[PDB]
Design a protein around this nucleic acid. Sequence first.
RNA 1: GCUAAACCUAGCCCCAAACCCCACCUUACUACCAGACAACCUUAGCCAAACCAUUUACCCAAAUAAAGUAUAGGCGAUAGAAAUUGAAAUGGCGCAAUAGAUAUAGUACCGCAAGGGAAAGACAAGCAUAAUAUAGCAAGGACUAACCCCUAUACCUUCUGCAAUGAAUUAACUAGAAAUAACUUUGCAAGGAGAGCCAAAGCUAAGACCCCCGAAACCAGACGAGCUACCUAAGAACAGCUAAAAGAGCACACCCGUCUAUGUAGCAAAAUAGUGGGAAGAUUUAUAGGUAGAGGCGACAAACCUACCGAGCCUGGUGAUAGCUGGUUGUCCAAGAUAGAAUCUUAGUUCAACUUUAAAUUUGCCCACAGAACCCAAAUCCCCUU
RNA 2: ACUGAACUCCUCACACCCAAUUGGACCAAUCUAUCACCCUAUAGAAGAACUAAUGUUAGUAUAAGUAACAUGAAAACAUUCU
RNA 3: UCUCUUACUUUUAACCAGUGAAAUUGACCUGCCCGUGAGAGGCGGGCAUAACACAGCAAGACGAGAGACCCUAUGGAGCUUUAAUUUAUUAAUGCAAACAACCUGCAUUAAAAAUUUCGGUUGGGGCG
Lengths: 97, 190, 243, 116, 16, 95, 166, 148
Amino acid sequence: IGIRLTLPPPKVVDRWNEKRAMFGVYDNIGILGNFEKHPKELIRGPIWLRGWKGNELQRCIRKRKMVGSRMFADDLHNLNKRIRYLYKHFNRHGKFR
Amino acid sequence: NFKRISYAKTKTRAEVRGGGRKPWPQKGTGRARHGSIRSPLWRGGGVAHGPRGPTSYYYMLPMKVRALGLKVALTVKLAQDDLHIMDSLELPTGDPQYLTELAHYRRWGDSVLLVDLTHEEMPQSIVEATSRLKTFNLIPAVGLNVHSMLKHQTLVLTLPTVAFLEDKLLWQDSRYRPLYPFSLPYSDFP
Amino acid sequence: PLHKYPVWLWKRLQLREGICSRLPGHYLRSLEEERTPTPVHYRPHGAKFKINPKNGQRERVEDVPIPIYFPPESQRGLWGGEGWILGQIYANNDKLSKRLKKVWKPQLFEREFYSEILDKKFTVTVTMRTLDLIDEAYGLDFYILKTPKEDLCSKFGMDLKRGMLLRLARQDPQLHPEDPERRAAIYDKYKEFAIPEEEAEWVGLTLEEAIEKQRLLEEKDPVPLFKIYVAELIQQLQQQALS
Amino acid sequence: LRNRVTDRYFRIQEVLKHARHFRGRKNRCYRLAVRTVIRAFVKCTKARYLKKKNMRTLWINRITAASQEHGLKYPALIGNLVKCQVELNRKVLADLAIYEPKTFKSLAALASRRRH
Amino acid sequence: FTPPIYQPKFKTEKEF
Amino acid sequence: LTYFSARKGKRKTVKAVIDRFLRLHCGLWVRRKAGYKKKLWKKTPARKKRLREFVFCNKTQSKLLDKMTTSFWKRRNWYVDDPYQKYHDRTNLKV
Amino acid sequence: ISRKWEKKNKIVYPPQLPGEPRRPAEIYHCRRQIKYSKDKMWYLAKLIRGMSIDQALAQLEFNDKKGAKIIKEVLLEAQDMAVRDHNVEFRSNLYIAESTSGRGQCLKRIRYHGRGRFGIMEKVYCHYFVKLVEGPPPPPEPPKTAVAHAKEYIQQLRSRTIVHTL
Amino acid sequence: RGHKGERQRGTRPRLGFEGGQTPFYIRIPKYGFNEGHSFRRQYKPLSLNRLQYLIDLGRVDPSQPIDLTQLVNGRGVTIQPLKRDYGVQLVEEGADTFTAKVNIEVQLASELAIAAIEKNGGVVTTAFYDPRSLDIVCKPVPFFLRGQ
RNA sequence: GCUAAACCUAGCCCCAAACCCCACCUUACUACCAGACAACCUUAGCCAAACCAUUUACCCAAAUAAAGUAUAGGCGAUAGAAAUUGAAAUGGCGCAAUAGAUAUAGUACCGCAAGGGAAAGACAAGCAUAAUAUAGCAAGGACUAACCCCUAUACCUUCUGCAAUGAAUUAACUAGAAAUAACUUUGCAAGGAGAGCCAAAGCUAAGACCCCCGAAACCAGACGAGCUACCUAAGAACAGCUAAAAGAGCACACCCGUCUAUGUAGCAAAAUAGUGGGAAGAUUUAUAGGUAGAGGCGACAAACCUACCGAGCCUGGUGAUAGCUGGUUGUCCAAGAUAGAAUCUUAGUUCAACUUUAAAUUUGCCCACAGAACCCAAAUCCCCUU
RNA sequence: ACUGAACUCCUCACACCCAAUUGGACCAAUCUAUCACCCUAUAGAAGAACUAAUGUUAGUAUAAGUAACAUGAAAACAUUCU
RNA sequence: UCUCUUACUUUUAACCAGUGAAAUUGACCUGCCCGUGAGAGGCGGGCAUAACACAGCAAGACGAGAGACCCUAUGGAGCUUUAAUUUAUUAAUGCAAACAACCUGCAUUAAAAAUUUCGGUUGGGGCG
Ligand SMILES: [Mg+2]
Ligand SMILES: [Mg+2]
Ligand SMILES: [Mg+2]
Ligand SMILES: [Mg+2]
Ligand SMILES: [Mg+2]
Ligand SMILES: [Mg+2]
Ligand SMILES: [Mg+2]
Ligand SMILES: [Mg+2]
Ligand SMILES: [Mg+2]
Ligand SMILES: [Mg+2]
Ligand SMILES: [Mg+2]
Ligand SMILES: [Mg+2]
Ligand SMILES: [Mg+2]
Ligand SMILES: [Mg+2]
Ligand SMILES: [Mg+2]
Ligand SMILES: [Mg+2]
Ligand SMILES: [Mg+2]
Ligand SMILES: [Mg+2]
Ligand SMILES: [Mg+2]
Ligand SMILES: [Mg+2]
Ligand SMILES: [Mg+2]
Ligand SMILES: [Mg+2]
Ligand SMILES: [Mg+2]
Ligand SMILES: [Mg+2]
Ligand SMILES: [Mg+2]
Ligand SMILES: [Mg+2]
Ligand SMILES: [Mg+2]
Ligand SMILES: [Mg+2]
Ligand SMILES: [Mg+2]
Ligand SMILES: [Mg+2]
Ligand SMILES: [Mg+2]
C-alpha cells in the first residue's frame, strides 16, 4: 500500500528557459577577461561560503565568525551548541585516529 | 558544481523544539528507554544525518585545465562540423524568423550559440533577433564556456572572437608560474 | 534570518534615532568616544615591545586592563578609579593548587573636602589613591576639572564637574557674593577649564538623564490651531490687500 | 524526506509471491514470509542431493523386487551382470523390470548362469 | 514505585 | 590530537612531539635515548656511549609522529649551518 | 471506505435472447454502521444464509439477539426494493444468496482500570450485506453416500501411475 | 566496525595513547632539536648549475646586475619571507661548468661559488635584507600597489 | 466486500536584500486618597585529560594568509596569537501532512506552578466470501492426486558452541558525518598553484574512508508548604454515663490504623467489612499566612517537603558521559583465524603477530649429510639437493 | 557381496558455500545536467534501500465476544407496594 | 481451629440479552515413554493419533509479571574519618592601613565546609 494508485501529474521541464540556456556563461571570466574577476566572484549565496568549502564544523565556525553578530539569538545559541557538538564528535569520535 | 550551494537543512535532535525531559523513567514502565521525545527514532524527532545548513560545493580546477577544456571543446566542435566562423554577426534584419530560417537552411543544429567579441559592439540586428529566441543564444567572447558549448549543438564564432580566443587560450601555454595574481600588473600582461 | 546590522551596533543605531538624535552633538560625541581609564589595579607595560628572555626575540606587548567592579556606593563617593577586584587566586600562589574566588576591596575613608568654585564642604567616601590624586592636582577643584570621566569613575564626581564647569561658564556671582575680588580670583585660578555653558550643561549626564533633559527642553504644550489659523488668515488678508 | 523508497511494494511482492502457498500468516506477513521463503529455497537447493539419492534407492528396491521374482538377490544380479560386462545402470534395470519383464527375466537368467 | 502514565485525552475522545 | 581546531578548523600539532623529535625531510625521525642524562655514575662506558647517541625511529613510530605533526614540520628548511643538512636526504637506497 | 455493494444494484445486463433461460433477479442491500459487533452479527448472517426470504424473516422474528431485528429490517427493505425496482414478481420468491457482516468505522474510548491504568474500549460498528436471488432456495447439498465414497476411492485407485519410471 | 568495544562504539582513546603505558612520544627525553626553529634564518640555495641554466635559457639577463628581484622575476628561485627565508645563498654545485660573466647580489655565498663567479670575470656581493625589505624585493609590484 | 488504501497544497526550511472606544501591577484586564522598597555584584558544572585535584575552544567586531607558527601547558590532555596581508557583492540538484516550523496551535490536553505539549485535511495487516481431518519450524523433493511417503533442531543478537536476549502483525519513519597520509585518474612539470604554500619529480585538482538509541548523575536559574512536616494569626468541635476541676474511666460524633478477611489493572496508584486504640487534650479540625532543595521541616522513621525524596520539580548547559547493553537497512564474488608485551590492566586499549589491498624485487618453504655441553625420550634447530 | 557423501569419475557449465575485517563487480529509487521526449540513457549528486533497537507514530489482531458492568415489583404509567 | 466435615442463604458462578477491557503473543499443523543434551511438544528410537465446542484442574510450557543473591565498571551518589587538597567564607588573634569603634590588605590558627579518590593476584572476609 505504500504506492500511489494514480500517475503523478506530468512534470514538464523547459530545457531552454533563460537560466538553463545561459548556465555556465562567465565561468571563464578570469581566463578570458584578463583575470580582472575570479570565477568564484560569480557565486551567489551565503556571505560566509562564497568561494569557500568546508565540512560542517568548518562551515559552522565560519558562519559564527562572519555573521554571528547578525544572527538571531536562538539561532546563534543553536550554532554555538552545534559547534561544540561537532568539535567533540570530530576530535573524539570515529573509527580512525 | 563549483557554483552550487545546496540550501537543504534539517533540524537535529538538539534543534527540534522541546525534548528536554526524559519521557519516562528507565525502568518500571515496561517501555523502551528514551531520553527525549525528539530523538531520531521518534516521529517528529530530529534527523540523524540529514543535510546540514547551506553547503557549498566550491572547488577550482587549475586554470590550465580549464583553458585546456575550452580548447578541447573548440576542437570537438570543429572536428564534428558544428563550428562556423562568421566575418560578423550583422543581420539584414532583427527578425528572429530570419535567423531560425537561416539556421534551418544551413542545416545548423536545433540550438546555436553565437559568440561576439565584446558585449557593447554586438550588432543591434543580431541582438534583437536573439533576444526573442530560446535556442539561439548570443554571448560575448568572455562568456564562452564548455557547458554552453556542449548544450548548444552549433557554435558560431566571429573572426575577432577567434583571434581573441586564440590569444587568450594560447597564453596559458608558455606562461610562467605566477608570482602573484595576474590581475596585478605584469611586464607584458594587459 | 539575519539582522541587517550587528546586534552590538544596535545601541549606536538607536542613538542615531529619536530624541537621542535630537541630543546635542557634543554630548553625543562625549558618549561615543571611549578612552581606556588610567591603570590603577595593574602595572602597565613600559613600552610597546619587549625582549622576552625565553627566546630573546622582540615581541609586542599589550596592556590588558583588569576588570574592575564598582559597587553603587562608589557613585556617591570619589574613588580614584579604584574599585573591587573580583577575581581568583591560586592557593599558596602555585598553579597546581586549588583555585579560589577572591575579592579585593579598597580601603574607604570618610573625608571632608572644600570646593573653592562651589564654596562648599563635601563629606565624601574616598580612597588613599583619591587623596594622592587630589594632592597631585593641587586641590579638589583641580582634580575634578582635570580628571576625565573614565578616570574619575564617579557619578558624584561628574556632577561636581558639571557644577564647577557651570559656575565657571556663567561666572556666577553666587560664588562669594559681596566679595567680587575673591570671586574673580577663583575664576581666574580655574580659567583654563572654562567651556561654553551650552556644553557645561551636559557634562557628566548619563544617557537617561540627558534624554530626560532633552525631553524637558523640547516639551511644549501644543499651540492651539486657532492661533495658527488666525496668523495664516491675517497674512493672507495682508497679501490680498497689498495685491 | 529528500530520498524515499517508492519500490517497497514490488520488493515485498517478490517474496510474497513465493510465499503465497504457505499456511497461516507466513503467506501474508513479510516478516514471517521472508524467513519461510528462505528456508523453502534452502530446502529446494539441498533436495537436489536427496532426489538423486532417493531415485537410486527406488531403483534398487524395484530391481530387488523384480530379481526376487526370479530367485536372484540384488547383489547377485548386479555383480554377475558386471562380470558379464553388461553395463546397464540401475535406472535402466528398474525400467526394464517394470516395462520389459521378459528382458529382465533374460538378464536374471544370465546373472544366475554367470554365478553358476 | 513507578507512577502510571496517562495517554492524552484526544486519542479517546474522538467522535465521527 | 585535535583534528579540527575550534577557532580555525585546522589540524593541530602535538607539541610534545616537537619538543622531543627531529624530523629529517625524507621521513626519518631522530630522537635521543631515554635516560641519557640520568645517573650516569652507575652506568658502564659502553652503556653511556649507547645512550649519548641520536637514534632513528620505527616505521610505525615515524607514522605516528607524522600524524601527530602538521605539514609545517615536514617542509624543506634551508638553515644556515644545519648539522643535519646531509642527513635530510637518503642516498643509494633500494626500495 | 468502500461502497461497492450499493453499486452492484446499478449494473444493467444486455437484453436476453428469446432462446435463453430467464436470468434470476439479484438485489443487493446493506445497512452501514450498525452499533453491533461484526462477530456477533456473523452468526445471524450465517443462520439466514441460503434460506428463503420468508423462512429467514420467521427465524429472525423469534431470535433474541439485537442484530436479528436489524437484519429483519434490512431484509424487509430488500424485499420492498426487489418488488418495486428490480421487477421481482413475487415477494416470497426470494432467497438469501449472500448474507455477511463487515467491520464498520469504530470509535475509540477509554476504559478506566484500577490503578490509574486504562484500556482503550472500541465502540464497535458493523455493516450488514444481503444479496437476494429470485427463485426457490437451492436444495441443500445431499450428504455423501457410501456409493459415492466408494466411487471416489476407486477413481483414485485407477488414477495411479507408475511414478518415477519410464 | 567490528564487535563491541571502544573501537566499535567510536570512543577509542586519542592518537598516541598506549593503553596507560607511558607513551613513546612522552617517554623520550625533550631535546632542543627544534628550539628557535622559527628564528633560524633560512637561505634558498641557488646553485651555479641553476644560475647557468637560467642565463642560458634567457630567464636571467647577465648584461644587467642580477639581484633577488631578477632571480624571482626569472623564476629561478622562490623566496618565502614568511617562512623565515632571509634570501638566497650561492651554492658551489655546478662550479666546474659555470661559464657566465655575471654581476650577482646574493645573501650568502660559498667560497667556491665566489671563486667561480670571479674566475668567469664576474662580480658577486653578499648583501643583507631584513624580512620587510626582502618581501618588498621579492614581490615589488604588490608593495607598489600598497601605496607606501 | 468490509476495513482500508492512495492524492497536493496548506504551509514550512535555508539564503539574499532590507534595520524592525473602555479596562488592565489591588485577587491584572478592577472608573475615583498620604507614596518612597525601588536595579546594578567573576557563572558553575557537565565534559576531555580514558580516575582526578592545575588544566580542558565557545557574537570576537576583514575573509584569506602569516599559522596550528610564536607561545602556553599535571610542558599533557590540550589551548593558541600578533606584527604583516586585504574579499567583492531574490534564489533553491530544500520538505510536501509521521516530512517541513511544535504549530490547523503554544490551542486542546497534562501540571499547584515554573513548565510540558498534540492530533488532524484531501487491492497492507485484520476479517468476510469460505471452520475443521491422524503426523508434528509447517516447507521441500515430489506426485495423477491437497494430505498421506521421504528429508528437514525457527530468525536475530550475545556467549567458545547449544542456552539466554528481542520480536503479535502491517504501514511509515529509523542509524558511517572527516582529516594526516597514501593509491588512482587528469593538468603542468624543475617547477606547480588564480599571492600566502610546497618542491632533490614535484605540485595542483578530483575520486575513496571514520554510525544510532539508552543511564544513574553534576551544575545554574526558576517553580513549588491548596499534599505533607513544623510554626503564626484568628476561629470551631467534642453525645451519654461514670466521675469530679483529671494529658481520669466506659463509650458516640470525630481522629487513628491493632488484627483478620476481602480486594490485588481493585470502588481505591493503599480501599472495604469486622475488630481495635484515642476520644476535654501533648486532641481533632476549617481558614489565611510563613519556612525551599544541601535548603526547609522532623516527639530521628533518613521520616515528610503535590502519588515515584539517602535528598523535590522544571528548564537550560545537553545530542552530558557511558571501556556497558541493544541496534546498525540493496545484490554478487573473492581473500580472510587464537597468538606475545605493557597497561589503576585483564568487559578496554596500544604495540607485535596474523589479516587485506597495491607495489618492487629475488629467492622462499620442504630438507640428506655435516654441525649444535659439560655438569651426569619423542624430538628440535640449521640447509646442498629436490 | 551389496548398500553407502557435496569424495572421485561421467554429459554439460563454472567467479557462484567461513565470523570480525578487507578488496572488488554490479545496483533500486530520488533529484539535477543533457537526452529520451514511452516511462529511458550517460553523468553529477544525496535525508540514497530495514525480517529485528522491551525502537517512534498510526492501523488492526491475540487473549476474547473473555474479565467486568448494569435496571426493586406490579400497573390505569395516575399510582400503589416491598 | 481441629477429629471431620456437612447443610442452607447471598455474592460469585454457568446459560440468555446488551455493552465490552488487560497483562500476554517469533511462527505453530502445539501428543506420550525412553534416550540425547546440564533441562525436549518440535532432535533420535518406540508408542499413540478422525475433527472440532463447553465446563473444570493446575503437572508442564526453566509459565507471565516482578523482585531477591553474587560479580564487574579507572559508572554515580551518600556517610565517616587520624584519606588527599584547600580556607575562598566566617571567628579569633598578629602585622601593616585609616586615627578607640569601624574598615582594608597580608599572614597564622580554628570552625564550618567544599572538591576528589577507592590499584592488582589469591571461594569471600580477617590477618597476611
Ligand atoms: Mg534540548
Ligand atoms: Mg520536525
Ligand atoms: Mg552492537
Ligand atoms: Mg574487542
Ligand atoms: Mg575525565
Ligand atoms: Mg507536522
Ligand atoms: Mg488483505
Ligand atoms: Mg518478548
Ligand atoms: Mg498549609
Ligand atoms: Mg464528653
Ligand atoms: Mg482521657
Ligand atoms: Mg510531629
Ligand atoms: Mg534511628
Ligand atoms: Mg514528588
Ligand atoms: Mg551516547
Ligand atoms: Mg572464500
Ligand atoms: Mg600506572
Ligand atoms: Mg574495560
Ligand atoms: Mg552414491
Ligand atoms: Mg569436488
Ligand atoms: Mg536513510
Ligand atoms: Mg517496514
Ligand atoms: Mg521494530
Ligand atoms: Mg473478538
Ligand atoms: Mg478464557
Ligand atoms: Mg462474569
Ligand atoms: Mg454475554
Ligand atoms: Mg525427556
Ligand atoms: Mg517449546
Ligand atoms: Mg479448556
Ligand atoms: Mg518472565
